[PDB]
Amino acid sequence: VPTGGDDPTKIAMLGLTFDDVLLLPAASDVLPANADTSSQLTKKIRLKVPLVSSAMDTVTEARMAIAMARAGGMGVLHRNLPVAEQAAQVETVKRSGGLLVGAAVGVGDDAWERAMALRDAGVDVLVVDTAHAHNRKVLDMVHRLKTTVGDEIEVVGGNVATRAAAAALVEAGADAVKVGVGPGSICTTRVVAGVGAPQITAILEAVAACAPHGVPVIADGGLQYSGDIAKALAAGASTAMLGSLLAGTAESPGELILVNGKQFKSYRGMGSLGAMQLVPEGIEGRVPFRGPLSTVIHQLVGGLRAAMGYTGSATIEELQQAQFVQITAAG
Amino acid sequence: VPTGGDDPTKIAMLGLTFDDVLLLPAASDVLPANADTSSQLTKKIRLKVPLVSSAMDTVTEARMAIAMARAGGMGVLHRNLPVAEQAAQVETVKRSGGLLVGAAVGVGDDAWERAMALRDAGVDVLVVDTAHAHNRKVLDMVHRLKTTVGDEIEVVGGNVATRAAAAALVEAGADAVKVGVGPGSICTTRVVAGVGAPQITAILEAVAACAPHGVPVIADGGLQYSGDIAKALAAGASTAMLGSLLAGTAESPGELILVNGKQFKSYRGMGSLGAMQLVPEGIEGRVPFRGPLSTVIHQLVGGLRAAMGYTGSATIEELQQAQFVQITAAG
Amino acid sequence: VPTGGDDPTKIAMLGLTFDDVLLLPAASDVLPANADTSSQLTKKIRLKVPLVSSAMDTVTEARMAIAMARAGGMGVLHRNLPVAEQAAQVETVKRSGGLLVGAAVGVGDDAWERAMALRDAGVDVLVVDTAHAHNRKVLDMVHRLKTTVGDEIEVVGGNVATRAAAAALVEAGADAVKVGVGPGSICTTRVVAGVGAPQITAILEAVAACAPHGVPVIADGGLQYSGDIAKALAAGASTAMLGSLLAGTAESPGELILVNGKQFKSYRGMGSLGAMQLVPEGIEGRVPFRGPLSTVIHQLVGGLRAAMGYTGSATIEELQQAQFVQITAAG
Amino acid sequence: VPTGGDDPTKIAMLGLTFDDVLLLPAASDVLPANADTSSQLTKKIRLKVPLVSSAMDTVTEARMAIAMARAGGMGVLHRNLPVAEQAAQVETVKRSGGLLVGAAVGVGDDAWERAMALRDAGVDVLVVDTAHAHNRKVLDMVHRLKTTVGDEIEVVGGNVATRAAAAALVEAGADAVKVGVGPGSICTTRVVAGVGAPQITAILEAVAACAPHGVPVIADGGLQYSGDIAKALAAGASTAMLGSLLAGTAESPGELILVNGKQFKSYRGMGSLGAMQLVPEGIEGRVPFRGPLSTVIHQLVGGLRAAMGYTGSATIEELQQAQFVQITAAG
C-alpha cells in the first residue's frame, strides 16, 4: 500500500470537501429566474427553498424560525433551554400563521418529555440532534418517535458521515438523514478528536444509502458560500442546513457587536464551553453582520438559481444529477 | 469510487488551471526574435499577435481597439452602452485606417438590431457574448448571424467550458469558440454558483471538439502572466482574450486612481453590481497602472516568444503541439 | 515512471502526516467517559493513559516525571546532564511513591555506565535514545541491555521510521519501538539533512513489523493537537510521546517568559546549538504557557476519549483497528 | 484522459521539486564525520566537496573561485565582462596555488575567442553556459571545444531539463551535463515564458540519459537548504551548483546593504534587466548576509554529511542509490 502498511482498507477513501470541486456547466434551457427551487426536507414535507437554519442558540429561536418559514425554508429551534420555553417558541411560530417549524431533541433523560411537549405545541418536524447518530440509543429514539408520533410528525435523525450510518438511520425509520460530522465553521472536533469526514464525500456516501429508500439527505455544516449550497445538492442532498451563513442576520439571537469599526454578531458552537455552561468541540466566535434574513436568503437562493441555469437543472431533482470537476490547490 | 458514491462519472475529470502546469523545453532551432507569432482568430481572420482584448467597459472602447489592432491583435468592443454608441465606436476604429475590430452582442431582445447596426458600421467580427453558450437561444443566434451576414462577418460564440458545448457551437456554425466559464480574475461565479472549469482542462476539452473541424479556440479569462498565454496556446487555443492584463493600460477606459502612493485603474466584471446598474457574479476592483498598451503587448509577446524558443515552436501551430509537465503545490 | 527516471522504487511511498488524515466515525456503543484509555508502553508495562513525556531538558526532569506518573502516564528523564544527577532524579521520583519512571541513555562511551547507574537507582524503563536506531551500535546496546538487565527493566529502542528498521529493533530484543525521524516541532533535520518520514506512514510501516511480534510502537514527534494522539494510536501505535504539548506546562523545566504581554516557556531541540553546548538539527524556541500538567493531560485524554466514542473503540486495542479518510489541502 | 483531451502524452509527467520529497533513513554504519563527500564534477575531475558556485556576477569572481577551490569545491567565473578581464580572473585564481577553476562561455560571436583566451589563462573547466542546451548551436560549441581543447580541458554543457536534451549533450561530447531550466531562486522564466521543469524530476530524467554513459550531472538552481543538496545527489546528480546559498557570503561580489537594521547583499539573475544592461527572465533581489564562505560551506557539507549518516551512504556514489518518500502539502 503506497501510503503504508499492508491493509488497503486502512485509509478507506479520499475525502473531498466543497472547495475540492466545481459544478460543470451543461446543456441548458433553464433560466435562473425560472428554475424550481423546491425540494424535500423529509419524505412528506417539501419546502419552497431548500434551506433550513441550524438548531443553535446563536442562530434559531422563534424570530428566525418565522422568517425562515416565510422565506420558504424552515427553522429548527435549538434545545439549549428549558422544555417549556422551547415549546413556547413553537407556539409563537404557530401564532404567526400556517408556518412550518422544527425543533431539536437529544437522547438524554429529558429528551422524550421534550419531544412530547413539542408535539403538544404543534411542531411539524422533530430533529433527533446528535453529533453521532450511529448509536443504538439514537436509533432507538428515532424509531420510537416514528412509531409513536410519526403519523403527524416527521422525524429527522443525525448526524452521520458514512454510508453505514445513514443506512442504520433509514432502517430505524428516519424521514430524513442529516449529514455532517466535523465540518462546521465553529467545529473543533477535527482537531480535538481527530475525527471528521469531508462533506462532499460524506454526502455522496450518505445519499448512496438514502436515495434508494426515498429518504432525503440534509447537508449540515461547512457551507461557506451560496455556491456550496448548489454543490451539496448536486452531490445528492435535498436540503442544506446553515449556521454561519445565517448567524450574521438581524433575526438571529444576540446583539450587534462593534469591533474596530465593523459590525459583527456572536456565533458559537453548541459544543463550546459557553454553550455547554469539560472538553469542548466548538469555539465561540463572531460573524459579520449581514442584515435582514430575507435579503441573505435572496442572495443564497440567487446563487443556487445561477447554478441551476449553468447546469440545465429545471428542478432540484435534476440538479442532484449534475457532474463535478475536481480541482487542485492552485485552482 | 475512492471519492464517494458508486458512480465513477459523478466527478467527471481532474481540472487543471494554468498554475498546475509548465511547458517542457524541447529540441529547438528557434530563436525567440524569429518565431512567427501569427495565429487564427477565426477560420478566416489571422492576427499578427494572438491576443484580443476583453469586451468589458473597463477594458475595450475605441481607443483600446485601435491600439490593439495597431499592435497586431484586435479589440472586442463591449456592449454595455447604447447600440448607436457602440456602432459609432466601430466607425471611429475604421476612421483610423484599415484596422480589424470586433464587437460584442447578447441574445436579448435588442441583440439582433445591435448586430445589424454593427454590420452597417463595418465590424469585422461579431462576438456572441454570453456566460453560457450551451443553450438553444445562443446557438440559434450564432447560426442566424452566420447564415445572414456570414459571408462578410466572422461570428464568434462563447463562452463554453466543455467538449459538448464546444461541439454544439461548431455545429451551429461558429467561426471561433471562446472558452472560459468562471476563470476570470474578477469572477465570482465559482463562489456564487459553485460552477466553473479550470482553464487548461477546459481548453484541452474544447480543442478536442473544435480542432478536428478547423475552428479556432479563444482562451478567455484567468490569464495572469505572459507565461499563461503560452500555456493556453500550447493547450491548443489559437488566441487569448485578456481583461486584467490590459485593464491597467493607458488606452483602457477610466481614470487613474491614486491609493497609498501607488497608481491603479478600476477594473470591474460585467456581472458586477456596478456594471449591471441582483445577484452579481463579478466584483469591482482595481489593477496596477501599467503604462502604454504597446509596451504591455511587447512584454506579453516577448514572453510568448521566449516560450516558442524553449519549446522549438517556429509557429503557433507548432506551439499547439508542445507538452506539459504537471507540477505540485510545492512547485 | 510518472515522476521521472525508470525506477519505480526510487520514490518508495507517499508519506502521510497527521494533517493528511481524519478518523472516520463508526458504529458505537461507547461513551467517551467510559472508554478504557489504558495501553501497553512496553511488552510488560501497561499505562492508564497512553502518553509519555519526551526525554528533553525543557520537558522532563523529576517534577514532570512525577506528575506524568500520577496522571497515569510516564516521564522519560533526559540525559543531558551528569550520570549522578540523572540517577538522583530517578531516586527522587521513587521517593514520591510507587511511580513508574523511564530514563534515556545514548550509545556513547558513558552510556553503559549511565544505564547501570539508572538500574541501581531503580529505573523501570531504559530508553536507548538516538536519532537513528537502524545501526549496529544501537542494536547492540539494546540487545546487551535486554540480556543483562532485561528481567527487571524494559528496554525501548528508537528512533525509526521504516519497517526494516523497526524489524531490526524487534530482532535485537526491544520491548517497545519508538517511531519518529524528523517530525518533531523543533526539528530541522528535514531541512538540514533532507531526511524524514511523515508520521502516519512511518507508524503504519513500523507497526507492520512490530505488531506481529507483540512489540508496542511509541509514536514520537509531530503531535500538535489532542486529535493527533487518536490518529497515532489508530495508525497502530500503542502510546504517544509528547514534547511541544507538554513543554508549556508548570511541571516542565525552565522559567516563565513574558513577551509582548503573553506568557511562554522555552522549548528547545536536543539537537539545537544550545542543548549541544556544530551542525544543529533542532531549534531553540518557545511555546505558550499552558498551566498545570494535570489540566493539559485531562484535555488531551478528553480528546482521545471523544475519538474513542466516535469510532466505537472501547479500548485502545480497538482504536488501533479504526479507519481513516485521506483529506486534501482544501480540507 | 482525466485531465482533458484524448492525448495521454500531452501532460508528459508529474514534476517533483525538492520540497516534494524526503530521503528515507536506511541501515547505516556510517557516521556523518566519516562519510566521504568527494564526487565527480566531470568525467575526469573529482572534487573533495560536491559543490560549485554559479557563474553569476553577484556570486563568482576570483575571490569566490579561490575560496571555493580551497574549501574543496570549485567556482565558475561569470562571463558578464570583457574577455581580457575574465581571463585575468582565471590567472588570479592560478596565482593562488594549484587551484581548480572553471569559467562560463556563451555560444555568441565572441564565445570562441573567449574560450581560447580562457584556455590560454589556464582554465580547467569550460562551462558552455546557456538557458537551453537542446540546440544545434550549443551542441556544436560543446563538440568543437571537446575536439579542440578536450585533452587538457573538461567541457560542461547546459542547461537541460529533459532526458532527450541530456542525451544530446552526451552525444556531443560533454564531460558533464548541467540540469536546471527555470528553477533558480531569482528566475522568472516560469512566469514569463510558462516554461520549466521541477528539479527532482529533471535530475531523475537527465541522470537516466547521463549515468549509463558515465557522464556526471550537475544540479543547478532551486537549492534553498543544505538538505536540498542531499536530495539532488540522491536523485542522481554528482554535484550541485549554488547561487542564492553563496551570494550572501563575504567572498561574493558586491557591497553590504543595510535595510531595516538587517544586513543583505544584492543577488540578481543574469537575465535581469540590470545584468543584461528587453524581456527579462530574472529579478534583481537581495539575500541575507551570511558571513565567510568557509563557514557557509561547512554548514552545507555538515547537512550533507548528516544525510549520508541517515541513509547509510559511505560515499556520494552510495547516496545516489538512496530512496525518497513523496510528501503532501501538509507535510
Ligand SMILES: C[C@H]1CN(S(=O)(=O)c2cccc3cnccc23)CCN1C(=O)Nc1ccc2c(c1)OCO2
Ligand atoms: C456535546 C455533544 C455535541 N457535540 S457538538 O456540539 O460539538 C456537535 C453538535 C452537532 C453536530 C456536530 C457534528 N460534528 C461534531 C460536533 C457536533 C460534540 C460532543 N457531543 C457528543 O455527544 N459527543 C459524542 C460523540 C460520539 C459518541 C458519543 C458522544 O457517545 C457515543 O459515541
Ligand SMILES: C[C@H]1CN(S(=O)(=O)c2cccc3cnccc23)CCN1C(=O)Nc1ccc2c(c1)OCO2
Ligand atoms: C449577467 C450574465 C453574464 N455573467 S458575467 O458577466 O459574470 C460573465 C460574462 C462573460 C463571461 C463569463 C464567464 N463565466 C462567468 C461569468 C461570465 C454572469 C451572469 N449572466 C448570465 O447570463 N448567467 C446565465 C448563466 C447560465 C444560464 C443562463 C444565464 O440562462 C440559461 O443558462
Ligand SMILES: C[C@H]1CN(S(=O)(=O)c2cccc3cnccc23)CCN1C(=O)Nc1ccc2c(c1)OCO2
Ligand atoms: C545529535 C544527535 C541527535 N539528533 S537530534 O537531537 O536532533 C534528535 C533526537 C531525537 C530524535 C530525533 C529524530 N529525528 C531527528 C533528530 C532527532 C540529531 C543528530 N544526532 C545524531 O545522532 N545524528 C546521526 C544520524 C544518523 C547516523 C548517525 C548519527 O550515525 C550513524 O547514522
Ligand SMILES: C[C@H]1CN(S(=O)(=O)c2cccc3cnccc23)CCN1C(=O)Nc1ccc2c(c1)OCO2
Ligand atoms: C538571456 C538568456 C539567458 N537567460 S537567463 O539568464 O535568465 C538563465 C541563465 C542560466 C540558466 C537559466 C535557466 N533557466 C532559465 C533561465 C536561465 C534566459 C534568456 N536567455 C536565452 O538565451 N533564452 C533562450 C531560450 C531558448 C532558446 C533560445 C534562447 O534560442 C533557442 O531557444
Ligand SMILES: O=c1[nH]cnc2c1ncn2[C@@H]1O[C@H](COP(=O)(O)O)[C@@H](O)[C@H]1O
Ligand atoms: O460546537 C460545535 N462543534 C461542532 N459542530 C457543531 C457545533 N455546534 C453546531 N454544530 C454543527 O455545525 C453546523 C453549523 O455549521 P456551519 O454552517 O458551517 O457554521 C450545525 O448545524 C451543527 O451540525
Ligand SMILES: O=c1[nH]cnc2c1ncn2[C@@H]1O[C@H](COP(=O)(O)O)[C@@H](O)[C@H]1O
Ligand atoms: O463579472 C464577471 N464575472 C465573471 N466573468 C467575467 C465578468 N466580466 C467579464 N468576465 C469574463 O472574464 C474575462 C476576463 O478575465 P481576466 O483576463 O482574468 O480578468 C472576460 O473576457 C469575460 O470572459
Ligand SMILES: O=c1[nH]cnc2c1ncn2[C@@H]1O[C@H](COP(=O)(O)O)[C@@H](O)[C@H]1O
Ligand atoms: O533537536 C531536535 N531535532 C529533531 N528532533 C528532536 C530534537 N530534540 C528532540 N527531538 C525529538 O522530537 C520529539 C518531540 O517532538 P514534538 O512533540 O513535536 O515537539 C522528541 O520526543 C524527539 O524524538
Ligand SMILES: O=c1[nH]cnc2c1ncn2[C@@H]1O[C@H](COP(=O)(O)O)[C@@H](O)[C@H]1O
Ligand atoms: O536571470 C536568471 N533567470 C533564470 N535563471 C538564472 C538567472 N541567472 C542565473 N540563473 C540560473 O539560476 C542558478 C542559481 O539558482 P539559485 O541557486 O536557486 O539561486 C544559476 O546557477 C543559473 O543556472
